[PDB]
Design a protein around this ligand. Structure first.
Ligand SMILES: *C/C=C/c1cc2ccc(N(CC)CC)cc2oc1=O
Length: 133
């Protein structure tokens, strides 16, 4: 399915530190961030997405339209400027963040009532799995 609407509670988190280290997140923010569980709230209407990931400390907010390139200032993460583009590869939602970092982006897909998120930077791949609340 291409329907990722929902409130999604973290079930698994693998190699979050490696991804954040690849982004050069400072040590203290990174060490706290690796410890924390996230809820992902995805508000999707056709091609229009609003994605909010919340923890007790760090936050992530992005709005986009599938297939429309946009400037992203990554800000609360690594404070960089990228040219972001979100598209479908089958039922996998693929984001490429064009900029200083290679292989930077993410992939989101549904596999049996679970939402998978892959965060990529360089040769680092973080895998997070969420359950629909
Ligand atoms: C497609 C959604 C990706 C995504 C990206 C994120 C970046 C940073 C963070 N945090 C804590 C809330 C910083 C450690 C979370 C996050 O969640 C996501 O789903």
């Amino acid at each position: 399915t291409r329907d990722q609407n929902g409130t999604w509670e973290m079930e698994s988190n693998e190699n979050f530190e490696g991804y954040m280290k690849a982004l050069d997140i400072d040590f203290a923010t990174r060490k706290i961030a690796v410890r924390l569980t996230f809820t992902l709230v995805i508000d999707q209407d056709g091609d229009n997405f609003k994605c909010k990931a919340t923890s007790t400390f760090l936050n992530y907010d992005v709005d986009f339209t599938v297939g429309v390139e946009f400037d992203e200032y990554t800000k609360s993460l690594d404070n960089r400027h990228v040219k972001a583009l979100v598209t479908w590869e089958g039922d996998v939602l693929v984001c490429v963040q064009k900029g200083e970092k290679e292989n930077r982006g993410w992939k989101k897909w549904i596999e049996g009532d679970k939402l998978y998120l892959e965060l990529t930077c360089g040769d680092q791949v973080c895998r997070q799995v969420f359950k629909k609340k």
